[PDB]
Tab-separated table of C-alpha atoms and ligand atoms in Angstrom:
chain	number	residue	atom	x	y	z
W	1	UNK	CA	141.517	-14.942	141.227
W	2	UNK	CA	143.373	-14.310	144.456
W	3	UNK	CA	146.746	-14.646	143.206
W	4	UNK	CA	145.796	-11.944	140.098
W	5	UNK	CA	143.841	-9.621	142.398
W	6	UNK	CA	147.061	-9.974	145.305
W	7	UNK	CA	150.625	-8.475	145.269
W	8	UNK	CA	152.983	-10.659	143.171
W	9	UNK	CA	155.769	-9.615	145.413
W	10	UNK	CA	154.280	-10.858	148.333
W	11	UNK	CA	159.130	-3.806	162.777
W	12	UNK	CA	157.530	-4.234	165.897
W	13	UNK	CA	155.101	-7.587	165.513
W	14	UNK	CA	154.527	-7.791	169.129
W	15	UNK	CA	153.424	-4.913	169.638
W	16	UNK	CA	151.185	-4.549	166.436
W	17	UNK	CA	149.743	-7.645	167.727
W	18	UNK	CA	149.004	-6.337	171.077
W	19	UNK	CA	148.463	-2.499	171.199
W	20	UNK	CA	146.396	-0.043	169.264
W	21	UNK	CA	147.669	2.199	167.029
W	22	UNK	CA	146.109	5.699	167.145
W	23	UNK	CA	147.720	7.401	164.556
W	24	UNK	CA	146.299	5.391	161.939
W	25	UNK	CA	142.950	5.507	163.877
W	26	UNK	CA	143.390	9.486	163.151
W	27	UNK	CA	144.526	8.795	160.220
W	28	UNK	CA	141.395	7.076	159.189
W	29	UNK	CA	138.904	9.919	160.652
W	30	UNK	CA	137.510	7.945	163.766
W	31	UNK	CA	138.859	9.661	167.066
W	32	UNK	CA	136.985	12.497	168.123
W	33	UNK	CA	138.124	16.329	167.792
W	34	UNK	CA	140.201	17.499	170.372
W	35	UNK	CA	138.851	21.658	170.847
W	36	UNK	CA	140.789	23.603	173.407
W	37	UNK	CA	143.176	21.559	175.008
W	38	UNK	CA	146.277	23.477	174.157
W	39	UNK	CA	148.530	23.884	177.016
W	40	UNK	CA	148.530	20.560	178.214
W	41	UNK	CA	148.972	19.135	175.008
W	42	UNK	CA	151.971	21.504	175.128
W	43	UNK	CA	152.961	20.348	178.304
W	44	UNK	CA	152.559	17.100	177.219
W	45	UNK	CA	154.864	17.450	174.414
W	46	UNK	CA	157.128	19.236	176.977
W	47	UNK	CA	157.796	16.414	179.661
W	48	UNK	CA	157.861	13.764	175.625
W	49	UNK	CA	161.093	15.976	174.522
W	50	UNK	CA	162.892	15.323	178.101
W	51	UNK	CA	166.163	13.527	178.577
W	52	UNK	CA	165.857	12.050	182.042
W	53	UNK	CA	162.303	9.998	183.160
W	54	UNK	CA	160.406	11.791	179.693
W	55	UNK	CA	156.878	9.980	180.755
W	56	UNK	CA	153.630	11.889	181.540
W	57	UNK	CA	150.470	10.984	183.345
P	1	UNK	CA	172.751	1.525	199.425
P	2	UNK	CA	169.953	2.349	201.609
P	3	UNK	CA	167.584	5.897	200.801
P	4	UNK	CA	164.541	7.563	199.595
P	5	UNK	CA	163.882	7.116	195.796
P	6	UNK	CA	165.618	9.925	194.482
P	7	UNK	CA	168.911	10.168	195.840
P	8	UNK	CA	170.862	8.433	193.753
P	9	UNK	CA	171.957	5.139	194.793
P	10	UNK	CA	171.833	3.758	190.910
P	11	UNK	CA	173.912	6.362	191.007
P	12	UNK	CA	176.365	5.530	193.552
P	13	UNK	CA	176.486	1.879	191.669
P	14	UNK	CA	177.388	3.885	188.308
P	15	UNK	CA	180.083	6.235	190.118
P	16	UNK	CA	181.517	3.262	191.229
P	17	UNK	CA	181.594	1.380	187.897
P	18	UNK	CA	183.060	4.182	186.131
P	19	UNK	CA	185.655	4.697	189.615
P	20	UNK	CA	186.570	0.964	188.596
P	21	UNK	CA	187.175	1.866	184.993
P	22	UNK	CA	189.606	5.416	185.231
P	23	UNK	CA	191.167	4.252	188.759
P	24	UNK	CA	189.947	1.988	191.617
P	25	UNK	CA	191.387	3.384	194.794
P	26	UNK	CA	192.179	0.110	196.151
P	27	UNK	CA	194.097	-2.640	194.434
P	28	UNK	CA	191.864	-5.685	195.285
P	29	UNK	CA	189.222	-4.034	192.238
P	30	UNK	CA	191.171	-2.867	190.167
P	31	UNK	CA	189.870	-5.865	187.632
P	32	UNK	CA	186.358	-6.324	188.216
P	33	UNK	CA	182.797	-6.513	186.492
P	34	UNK	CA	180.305	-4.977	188.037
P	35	UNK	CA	177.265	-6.266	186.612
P	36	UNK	CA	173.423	-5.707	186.925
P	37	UNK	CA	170.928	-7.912	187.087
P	38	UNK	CA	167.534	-7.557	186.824
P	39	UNK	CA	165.110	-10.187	187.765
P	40	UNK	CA	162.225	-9.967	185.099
P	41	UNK	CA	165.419	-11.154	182.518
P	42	UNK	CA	166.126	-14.310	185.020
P	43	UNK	CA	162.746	-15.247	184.954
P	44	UNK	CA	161.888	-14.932	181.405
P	45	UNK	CA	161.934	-17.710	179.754
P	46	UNK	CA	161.744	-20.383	182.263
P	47	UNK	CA	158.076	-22.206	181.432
P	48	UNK	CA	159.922	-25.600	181.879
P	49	UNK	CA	160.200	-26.792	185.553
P	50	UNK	CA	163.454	-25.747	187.364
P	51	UNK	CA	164.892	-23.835	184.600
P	52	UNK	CA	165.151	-21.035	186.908
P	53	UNK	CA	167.007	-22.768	189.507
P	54	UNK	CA	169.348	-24.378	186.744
P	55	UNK	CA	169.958	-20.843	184.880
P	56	UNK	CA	170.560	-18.968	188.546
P	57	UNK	CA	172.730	-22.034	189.331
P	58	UNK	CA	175.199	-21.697	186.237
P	59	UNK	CA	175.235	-18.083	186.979
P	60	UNK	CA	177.026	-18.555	190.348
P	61	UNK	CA	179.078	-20.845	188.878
P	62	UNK	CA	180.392	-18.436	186.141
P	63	UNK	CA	181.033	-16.173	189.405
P	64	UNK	CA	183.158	-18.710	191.071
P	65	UNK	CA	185.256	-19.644	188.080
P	66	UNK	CA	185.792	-15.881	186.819
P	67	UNK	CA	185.899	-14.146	190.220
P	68	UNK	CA	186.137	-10.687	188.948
P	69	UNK	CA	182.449	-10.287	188.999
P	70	UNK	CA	181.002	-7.509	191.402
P	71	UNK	CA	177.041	-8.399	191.343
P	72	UNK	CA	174.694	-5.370	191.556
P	73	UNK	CA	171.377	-6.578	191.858
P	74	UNK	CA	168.989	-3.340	191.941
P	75	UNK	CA	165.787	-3.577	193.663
P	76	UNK	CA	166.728	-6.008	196.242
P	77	UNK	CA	163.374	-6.520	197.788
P	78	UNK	CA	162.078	-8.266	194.659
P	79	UNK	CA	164.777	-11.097	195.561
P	80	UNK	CA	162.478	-12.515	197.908
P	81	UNK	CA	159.794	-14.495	195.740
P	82	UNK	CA	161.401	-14.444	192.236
P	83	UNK	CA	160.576	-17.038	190.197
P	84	UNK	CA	159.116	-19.015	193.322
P	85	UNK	CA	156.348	-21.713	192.681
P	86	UNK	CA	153.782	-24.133	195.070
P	87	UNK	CA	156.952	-25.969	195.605
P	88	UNK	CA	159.701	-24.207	193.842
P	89	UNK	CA	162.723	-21.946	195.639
P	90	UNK	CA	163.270	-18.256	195.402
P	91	UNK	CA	166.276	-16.404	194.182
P	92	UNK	CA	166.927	-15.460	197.561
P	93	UNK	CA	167.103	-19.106	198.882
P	94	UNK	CA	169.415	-19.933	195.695
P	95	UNK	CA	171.591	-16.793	196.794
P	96	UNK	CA	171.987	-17.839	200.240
P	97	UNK	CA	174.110	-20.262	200.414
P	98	UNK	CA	176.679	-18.794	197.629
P	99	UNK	CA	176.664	-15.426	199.751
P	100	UNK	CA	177.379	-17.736	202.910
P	101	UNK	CA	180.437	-19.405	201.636
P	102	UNK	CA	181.792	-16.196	199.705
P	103	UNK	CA	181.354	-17.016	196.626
P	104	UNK	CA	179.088	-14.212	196.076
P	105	UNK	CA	180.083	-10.636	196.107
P	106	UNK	CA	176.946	-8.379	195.711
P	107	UNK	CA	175.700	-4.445	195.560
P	108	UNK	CA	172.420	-4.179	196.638
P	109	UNK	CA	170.340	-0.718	196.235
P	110	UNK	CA	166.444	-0.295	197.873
P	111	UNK	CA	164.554	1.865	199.976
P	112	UNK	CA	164.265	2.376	203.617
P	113	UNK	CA	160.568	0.785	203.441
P	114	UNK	CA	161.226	-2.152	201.054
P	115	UNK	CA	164.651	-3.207	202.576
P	116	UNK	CA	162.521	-3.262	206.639
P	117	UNK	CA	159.512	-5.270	205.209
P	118	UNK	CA	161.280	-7.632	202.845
P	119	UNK	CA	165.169	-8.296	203.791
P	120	UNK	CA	164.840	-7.906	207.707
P	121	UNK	CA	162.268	-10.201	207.710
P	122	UNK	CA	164.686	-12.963	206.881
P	123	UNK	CA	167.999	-13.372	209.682
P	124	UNK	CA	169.644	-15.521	207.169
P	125	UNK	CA	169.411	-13.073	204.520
P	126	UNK	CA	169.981	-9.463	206.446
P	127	UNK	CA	173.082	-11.121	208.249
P	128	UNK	CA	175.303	-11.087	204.810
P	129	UNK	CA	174.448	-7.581	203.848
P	130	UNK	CA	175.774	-4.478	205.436
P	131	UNK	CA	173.204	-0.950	204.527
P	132	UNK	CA	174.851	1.900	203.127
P	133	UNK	CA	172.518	4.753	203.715
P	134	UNK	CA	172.660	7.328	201.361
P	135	UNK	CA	171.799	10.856	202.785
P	136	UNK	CA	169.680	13.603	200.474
P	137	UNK	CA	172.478	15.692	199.383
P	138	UNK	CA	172.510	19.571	200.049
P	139	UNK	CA	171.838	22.884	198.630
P	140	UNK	CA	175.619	23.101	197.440
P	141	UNK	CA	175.803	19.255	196.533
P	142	UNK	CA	172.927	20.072	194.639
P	143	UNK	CA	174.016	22.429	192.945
P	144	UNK	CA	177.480	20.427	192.111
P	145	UNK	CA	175.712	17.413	190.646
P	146	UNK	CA	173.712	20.202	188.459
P	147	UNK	CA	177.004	21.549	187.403
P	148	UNK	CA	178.570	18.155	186.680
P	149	UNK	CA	175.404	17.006	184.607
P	150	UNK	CA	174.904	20.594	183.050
P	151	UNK	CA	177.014	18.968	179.765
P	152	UNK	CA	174.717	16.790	179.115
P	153	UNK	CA	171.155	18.070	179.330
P	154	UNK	CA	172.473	21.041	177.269
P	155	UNK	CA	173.880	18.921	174.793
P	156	UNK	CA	170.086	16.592	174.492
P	157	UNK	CA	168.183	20.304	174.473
P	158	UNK	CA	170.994	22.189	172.347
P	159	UNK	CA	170.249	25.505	175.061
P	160	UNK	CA	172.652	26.982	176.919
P	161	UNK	CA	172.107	26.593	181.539
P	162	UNK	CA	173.289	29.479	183.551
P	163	UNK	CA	174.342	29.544	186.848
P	164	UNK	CA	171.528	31.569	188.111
P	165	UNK	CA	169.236	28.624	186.273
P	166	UNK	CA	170.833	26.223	188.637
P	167	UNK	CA	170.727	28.078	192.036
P	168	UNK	CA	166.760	28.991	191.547
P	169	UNK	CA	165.644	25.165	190.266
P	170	UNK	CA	167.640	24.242	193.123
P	171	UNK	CA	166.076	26.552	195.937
P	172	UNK	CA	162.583	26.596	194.390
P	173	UNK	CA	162.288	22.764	194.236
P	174	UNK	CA	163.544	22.436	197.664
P	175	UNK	CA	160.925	25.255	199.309
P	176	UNK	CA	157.861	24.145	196.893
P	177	UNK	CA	158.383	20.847	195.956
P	178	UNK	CA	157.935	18.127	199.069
P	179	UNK	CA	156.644	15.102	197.872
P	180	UNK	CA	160.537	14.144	196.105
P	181	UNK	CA	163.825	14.860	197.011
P	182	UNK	CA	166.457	17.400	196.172
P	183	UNK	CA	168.602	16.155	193.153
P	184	UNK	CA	165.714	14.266	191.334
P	185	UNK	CA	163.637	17.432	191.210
P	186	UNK	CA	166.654	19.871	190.664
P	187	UNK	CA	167.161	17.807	187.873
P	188	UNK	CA	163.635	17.678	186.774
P	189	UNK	CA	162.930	21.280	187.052
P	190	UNK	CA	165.955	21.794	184.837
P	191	UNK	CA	165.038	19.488	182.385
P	192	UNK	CA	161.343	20.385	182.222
P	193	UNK	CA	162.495	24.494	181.427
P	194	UNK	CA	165.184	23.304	179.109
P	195	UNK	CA	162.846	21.297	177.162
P	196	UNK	CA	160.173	24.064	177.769
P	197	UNK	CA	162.420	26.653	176.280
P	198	UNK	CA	163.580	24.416	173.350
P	199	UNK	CA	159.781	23.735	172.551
P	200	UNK	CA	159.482	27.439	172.356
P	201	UNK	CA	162.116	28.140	169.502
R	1	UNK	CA	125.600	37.269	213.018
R	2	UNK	CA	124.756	38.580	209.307
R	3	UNK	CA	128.204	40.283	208.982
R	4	UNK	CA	129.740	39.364	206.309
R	5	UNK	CA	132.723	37.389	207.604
R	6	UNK	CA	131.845	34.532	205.406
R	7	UNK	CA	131.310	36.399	202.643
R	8	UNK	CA	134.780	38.370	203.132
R	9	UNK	CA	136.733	34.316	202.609
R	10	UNK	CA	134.520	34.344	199.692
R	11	UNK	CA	135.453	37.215	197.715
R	12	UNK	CA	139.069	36.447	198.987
R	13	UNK	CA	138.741	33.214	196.783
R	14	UNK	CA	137.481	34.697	193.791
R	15	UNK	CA	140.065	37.627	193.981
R	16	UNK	CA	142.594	34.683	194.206
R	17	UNK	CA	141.344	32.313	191.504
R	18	UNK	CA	138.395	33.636	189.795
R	19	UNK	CA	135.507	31.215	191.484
R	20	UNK	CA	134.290	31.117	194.818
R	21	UNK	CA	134.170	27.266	194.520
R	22	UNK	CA	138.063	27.500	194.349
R	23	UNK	CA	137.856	27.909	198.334
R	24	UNK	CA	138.641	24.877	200.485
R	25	UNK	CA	135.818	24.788	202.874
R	26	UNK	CA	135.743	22.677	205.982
R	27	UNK	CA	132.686	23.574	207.633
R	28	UNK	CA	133.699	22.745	211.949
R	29	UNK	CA	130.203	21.777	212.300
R	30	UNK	CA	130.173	18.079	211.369
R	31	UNK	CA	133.465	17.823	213.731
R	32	UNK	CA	131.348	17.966	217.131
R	33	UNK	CA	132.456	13.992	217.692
R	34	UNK	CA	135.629	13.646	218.728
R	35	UNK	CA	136.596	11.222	216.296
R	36	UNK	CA	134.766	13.040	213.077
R	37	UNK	CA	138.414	14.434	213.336
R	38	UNK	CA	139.287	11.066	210.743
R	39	UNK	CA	137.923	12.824	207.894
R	40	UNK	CA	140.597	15.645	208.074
R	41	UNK	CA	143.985	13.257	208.774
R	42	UNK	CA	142.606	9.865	208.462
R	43	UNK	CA	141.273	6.650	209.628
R	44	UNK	CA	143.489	5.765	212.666
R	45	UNK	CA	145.860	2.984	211.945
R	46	UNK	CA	144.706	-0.377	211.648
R	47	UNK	CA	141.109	0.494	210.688
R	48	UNK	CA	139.637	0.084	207.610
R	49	UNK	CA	140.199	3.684	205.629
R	50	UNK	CA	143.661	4.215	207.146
R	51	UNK	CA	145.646	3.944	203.899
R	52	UNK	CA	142.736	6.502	201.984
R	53	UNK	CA	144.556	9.872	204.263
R	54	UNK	CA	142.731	12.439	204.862
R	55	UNK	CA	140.131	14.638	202.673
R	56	UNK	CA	141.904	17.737	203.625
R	57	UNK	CA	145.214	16.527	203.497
R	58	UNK	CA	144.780	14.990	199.953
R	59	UNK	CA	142.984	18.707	199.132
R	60	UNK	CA	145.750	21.086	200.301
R	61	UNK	CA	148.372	18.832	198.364
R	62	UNK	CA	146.329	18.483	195.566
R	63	UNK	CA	146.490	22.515	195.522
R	64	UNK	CA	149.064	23.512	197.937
R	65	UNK	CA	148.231	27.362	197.297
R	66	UNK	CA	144.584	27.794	198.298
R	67	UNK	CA	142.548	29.478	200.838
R	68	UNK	CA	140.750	27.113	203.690
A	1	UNK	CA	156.998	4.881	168.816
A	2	UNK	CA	155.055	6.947	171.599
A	3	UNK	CA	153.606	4.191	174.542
A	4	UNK	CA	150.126	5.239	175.438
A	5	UNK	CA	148.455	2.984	178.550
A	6	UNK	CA	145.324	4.016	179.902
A	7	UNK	CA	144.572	3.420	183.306
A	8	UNK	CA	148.370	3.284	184.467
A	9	UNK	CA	147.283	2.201	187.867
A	10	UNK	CA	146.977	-0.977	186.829
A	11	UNK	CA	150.743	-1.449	185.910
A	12	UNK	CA	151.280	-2.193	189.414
A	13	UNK	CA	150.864	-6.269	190.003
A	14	UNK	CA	149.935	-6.363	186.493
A	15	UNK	CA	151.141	-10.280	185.895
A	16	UNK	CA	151.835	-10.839	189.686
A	17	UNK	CA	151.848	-14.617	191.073
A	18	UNK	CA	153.527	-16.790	193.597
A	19	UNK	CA	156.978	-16.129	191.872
A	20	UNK	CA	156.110	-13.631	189.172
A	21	UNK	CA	157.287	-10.157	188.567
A	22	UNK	CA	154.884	-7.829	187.900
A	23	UNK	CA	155.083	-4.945	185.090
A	24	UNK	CA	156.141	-2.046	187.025
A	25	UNK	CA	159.117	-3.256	188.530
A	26	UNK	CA	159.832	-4.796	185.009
A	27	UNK	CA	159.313	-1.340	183.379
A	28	UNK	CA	161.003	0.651	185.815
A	29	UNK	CA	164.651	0.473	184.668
A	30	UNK	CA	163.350	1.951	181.113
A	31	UNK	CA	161.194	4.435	182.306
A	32	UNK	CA	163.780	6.364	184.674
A	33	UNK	CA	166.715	6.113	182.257
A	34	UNK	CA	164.388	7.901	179.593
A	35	UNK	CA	164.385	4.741	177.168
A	36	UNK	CA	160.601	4.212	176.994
A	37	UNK	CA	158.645	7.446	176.010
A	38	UNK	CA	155.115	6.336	177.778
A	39	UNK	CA	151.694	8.302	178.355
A	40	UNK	CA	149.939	7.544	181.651
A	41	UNK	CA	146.063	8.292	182.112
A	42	UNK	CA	144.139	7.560	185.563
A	43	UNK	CA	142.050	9.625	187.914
A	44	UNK	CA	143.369	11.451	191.126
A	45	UNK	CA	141.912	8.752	192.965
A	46	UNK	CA	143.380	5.519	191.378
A	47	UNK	CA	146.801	7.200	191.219
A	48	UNK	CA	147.164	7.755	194.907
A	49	UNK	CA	145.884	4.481	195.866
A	50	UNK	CA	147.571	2.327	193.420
A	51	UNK	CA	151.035	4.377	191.800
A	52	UNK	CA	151.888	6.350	195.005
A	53	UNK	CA	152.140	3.355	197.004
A	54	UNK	CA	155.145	2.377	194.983
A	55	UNK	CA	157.519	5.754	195.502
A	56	UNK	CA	159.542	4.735	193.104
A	57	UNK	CA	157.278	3.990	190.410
A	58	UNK	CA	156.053	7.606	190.993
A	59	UNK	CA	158.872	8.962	191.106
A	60	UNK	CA	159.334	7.978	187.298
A	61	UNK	CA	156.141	9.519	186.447
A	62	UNK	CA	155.186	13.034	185.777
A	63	UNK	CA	151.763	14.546	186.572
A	64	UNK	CA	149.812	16.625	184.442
A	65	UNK	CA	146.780	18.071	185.408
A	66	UNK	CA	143.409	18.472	183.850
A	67	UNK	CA	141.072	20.358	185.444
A	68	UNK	CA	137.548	20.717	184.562
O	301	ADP	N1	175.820	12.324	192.310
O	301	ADP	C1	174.978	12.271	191.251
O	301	ADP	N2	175.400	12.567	190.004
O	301	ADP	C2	174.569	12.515	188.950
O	301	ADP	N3	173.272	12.174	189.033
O	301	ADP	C3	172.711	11.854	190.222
O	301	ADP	C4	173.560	11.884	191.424
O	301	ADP	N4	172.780	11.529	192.457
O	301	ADP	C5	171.541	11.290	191.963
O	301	ADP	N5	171.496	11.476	190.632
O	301	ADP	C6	170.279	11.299	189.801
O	301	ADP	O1	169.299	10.612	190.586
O	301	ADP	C7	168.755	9.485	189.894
O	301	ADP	C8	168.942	8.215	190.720
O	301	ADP	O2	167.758	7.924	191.458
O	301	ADP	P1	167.628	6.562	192.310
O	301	ADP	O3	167.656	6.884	193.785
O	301	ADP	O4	168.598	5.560	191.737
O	301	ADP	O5	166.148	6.071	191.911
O	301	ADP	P2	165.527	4.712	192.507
O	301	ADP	O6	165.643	4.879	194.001
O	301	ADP	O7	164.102	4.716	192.012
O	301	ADP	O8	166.408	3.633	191.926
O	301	ADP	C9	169.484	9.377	188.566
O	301	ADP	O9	168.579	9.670	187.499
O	301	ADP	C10	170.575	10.423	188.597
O	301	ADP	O10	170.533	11.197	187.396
O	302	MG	MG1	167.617	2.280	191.076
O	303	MG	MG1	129.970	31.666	208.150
C-alpha cells in the first residue's frame, strides 16, 4: 500500500536540517501580518542588495 | 599590520599579493605564495587526539620543502588557544619553534587591543614579530581609494558615482560618523546610496 | 519660579521632533553625591558596572542630534 | 538563501572551549567580504554588551533601527 500510494521514482541538507525556513512558513499562512513597517523593510532590502559587508541588524 | 578595524590591513595583505603578482619591487619575492589561513579550517576536523598537532605539523613541513610560501595568518590573537585541550598544545606553541629557526615566514594583521592583551603577553611569541601600524588614511587618501574602487561598486549597482558623490560621503562620514573609521564608512556610505538609488529605479 | 523656563526646553523638543518625550532629560537633582556622577559616564574602573558606560553617554549616541 | 539569526549577540563565544573557535571569528571572513547575506535581530542592550565588545565583529554589521 505504501509503495502504490508513494512516488515510483523515488541542496543545502545541513542547513535544512538545522535552520527554519520562513518562506515556506509564509508560504503556508502561519507568520503573522506585517502592517506598516515599510521603510525599514526598505532599508532592509537596501543594506541585502550591497556589495561590501551586505548584513543588517 | 597593527590598526583600528577599518583601515585596511586585509587590505594591505591583498595589495601586497597582487604587488607580488604584476611586479615585486624586490627580487627575493618575486616567486612567492602568500597564503591565508584561517584557524576554524585547521581545527575542523580534528575529533581524533593530536590530529591538530599532526595536520599543523605537515603544514610547516610543506613550508620548509617549498619555501616560496609567505604565511598570512589574519586575526593573530586567535593563535593563542587554537585547538588547545586539558593537555594538548596551541597553534602558537606549534608556531614557535618553526618561527625561531626561520623556517616560518608570516603576515600577521590584528588590532591595537587584541595584539596588547594576547601576543605581548607571551616574550617568546612578540619577540619574532615586528608591528606595522597602519594609520587611518586622510581626507584625500580617502577620496583616492574611493576613486580606485569607484569601478567596481558601479559595476555591482550598474549607477554611475560622481565626483561630488565621493567628496560629500567622504566629509559627511568623517564629521557625523565617529564610532568607525574613514575608508570603511566612505565606502559604506557609498555603497548604502548606490544601492539606495538602484532600489529606487 | 513658575516661569516657564522648563516649559520653553519643552516646546523646543516638540518643535524639533514632534514629542516632548523626545527630550533627553537629566534632572541635576539626584547628582547631589559626588559620586551619583557614575550614572552619567560610568562605574569607575574596576567596579562592578564599569563596562555598562554611562546612561547619558549611551543616550546622546544612541541619538546624537537631540536636545538635553 | 537569505541567513536570518535572531538574537545575534549570541554569535559571540557561540561554541567556545579550552581550544575552540567560536562562531564569530569563524563567520567573520564571510560576512565582511559580502559572501554571507545574514539578518541580525537583538535589543540595544544585548548589542552593546555582547557585539560591540568585538569592534570588528561590529564593524561587519549594519544597524537598523526600530523605534517604537
Ligand atoms: N587602500 C585600500 N584600497 C581599497 N580598499 C581598502 C583600502 N583600505 C581599506 N580598504 C577597505 O577596508 C576594508 C578592510 O578592513 P580591515 O581593517 O581589514 O577589517 P578588519 O580589521 O576587521 O580585518 C576592506 O573591505 C577594504 O575594502
Ligand atoms: Mg582582516
Ligand atoms: Mg524646571
Amino acid at each position: 500500500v505504501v509503495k502504490a500510494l508513494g512516488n515510483p521514482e523515488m541542496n543545502t541538507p545541513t542547513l535544512d536540517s538545522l535552520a527554519r525556513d520562513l518562506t515556506v512558513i509564509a508560504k503556508d499562512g502561519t507568520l503573522d501580518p506585517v502592517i506598516g513597517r515599510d521603510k525599514e523593510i526598505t532599508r532592509v532590502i537596501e543594506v541585502l542588495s550591497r556589495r561590501t559587508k551586505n548584513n543588517p541588524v | 599590520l597593527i590598526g583600528e578595524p577599518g583601515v585596511g590591513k586585509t587590505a594591505i595583505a591583498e595589495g601586497l599579493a597582487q604587488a607580488i603578482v604584476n611586479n615585486e619591487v624586490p627580487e627575493t619575492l618575486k616567486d612567492k605564495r602568500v597564503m591565508s589561513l584561517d584557524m576554524g579550517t585547521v581545527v575542523a576536523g580534528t575529533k581524533y587526539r593530536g590530529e591538530f598537532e599532526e595536520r599543523l605539523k605537515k603544514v610547516m613541513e610543506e613550508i620548509q620543502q617549498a619555501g616560496n610560501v609567505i604565511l598570512f595568518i589574519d586575526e593573530l590573537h586567535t593563535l593563542v588557544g587554537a585547538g588547545g585541550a586539558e593537555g594538548a598544545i596551541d597553534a602558537s606553541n606549534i608556531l614557535k619553534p618553526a618561527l625561531a629557526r626561520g623556517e616560518l615566514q608570516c603576515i600577521g594583521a590584528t588590532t591595537l587591543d587584541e595584539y596588547r592583551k594576547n601576543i605581548e603577553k607571551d616574550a617568546a611569541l612578540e619577540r619574532r614579530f615586528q608591528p606595522v601600524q597602519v594609520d587611518e588614511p586622510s581626507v584625500v587618501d580617502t577620496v583616492a581609494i574611493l576613486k580606485g574602487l569607484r569601478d567596481r561598486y558601479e559595476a555591482h549597482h550598474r549607477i554611475n558615482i560622481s565626483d561630488e558623490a565621493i567628496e560629500a560621503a567622504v566629509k559627511l562620514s568623517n564629521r557625523y560618523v565617529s564610532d568607525r573609521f574613514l575608508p570603511d564608512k566612505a565606502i559604506d556610505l557609498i555603497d548604502e546610496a548606490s544601492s539606495k538609488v538602484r532600489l529606487k529605479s | 519660579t513658575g516661569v516657564g523656563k522648563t516649559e520653553l526646553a519643552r516646546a523646543l523638543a516638540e518643535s524639533m521632533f514632534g514629542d516632548d518625550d523626545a527630550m533627553i532629560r537629566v534632572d541635576m537633582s539626584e547628582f547631589m553625591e559626588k559620586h551619583a556622577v557614575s550614572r552619567l559616564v560610568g562605574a569607575p574602573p574596576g567596579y562592578v558596572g564599569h563596562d555598562d558606560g554611562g546612561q547619558l553617554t549611551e543616550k546622546v549616541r544612541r541619538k546624537p542630534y537631540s536636545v538635553i
